Symmetry: none
Subunit: 78 residues, 6 copies
């Protein structure tokens, strides 16, 4: 498995990479959509353009891509 | 291989929390993108190229969850090693 | 022993057919948040409005998925 | 004749032309409202659904409310 | 060449007339239902929120008389 | 004479042909959103006043045929 191991460890680091990316997108998004809300809504000041809050989900997306660290084999086997 | 199998079995349960989560983020922007693109054109009926577009992801959202669910058949043979 | 890591291969697959989806999804949400930006302005015009570019991200997820293979 | 012919054509078209605008000024209300309600339900339920996007389609036909134009009169 | 263009022109049109006939009905239905939804919908709210307006009268009617005019633009033998 | 028409016509029929598919589709898919909630509505009650589906399959099974059945015109 020594070999079988690494595959696991490797087929792992990649994921967190994603996870990173994922919670990385939304970012700009919640922001963009959060400004166009504030600008569009702001035009009206001559009916109310709602807002979006998704922060909580995002930082809970990393704490995980940070957890998956330990699921990585230890390389004590033999 | 006491921690090994586990470690793996672990990886899943964390990952799976990501997918479920993620969706919600997405189903959370889908509403308000669709909500605002609806208050926009409303303010307008009050000029044509100014059409407020819609967004549907539900089926992209739905796919992630058999995916998060079915993983529950991957988990290694806990007590049978 | 075939049945040992069997789950494994089978596992990695699924996770893959997720970021695909995940990315297949964002581009869209990406495509409508931008439009409405265009539309708006064109109201004050005919007050900025940010744009966004998740592209490289929408890109790499797919790749980060071919690695798994 | 002839001038009665082709002209009875320059009719079939300007006729079509309106139906296409209409067949697309209602469509854009059968989404402009299926997306108004679809909403509320959710907006309610909270205290699943789904929106409608048919702009590719609705503009496509609207675009043909022009090109049939280089298909009218003649001499 | 021309002694057979009438036909083409001919049938060529009568069809379009029912496709658009078709379009007047169909579109018509989704006008009802959608309101037999804001209905169910709205009706729920009392037992603010409000499933709203949907009057696409115009269109179907218009699509109708356009349906009546084309036999007119039909070359006559 | 007509050789700058018998094609302006053969041309004419196209934009039209392809305005039917855009029609159907414009409802074939919108058809769904209406019977979608037409049930998310029910379930909002079921468990706890009527959701009528919608059925325009034929209307959407017409517009398409008047399309193929239009190749006899050249």
């Amino acid at each position: 498995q020594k070999q079988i191991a690494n595959q696991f460890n490797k087929a792992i680091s990649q994921i967190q990479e994603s996870l990173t990316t994922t919670s990385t997108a939304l970012g700009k998004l919640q922001d963009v959509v959060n400004q166009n809300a504030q600008a569009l809504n702001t035009l009206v000041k001559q009916i109310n353009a709602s807002v979006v809050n998704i922060q909580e989900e995002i930082d809970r997306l990393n704490e995980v891509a940070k957890n998956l660290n330990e699921s990585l084999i230890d390389l004590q086997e033999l």
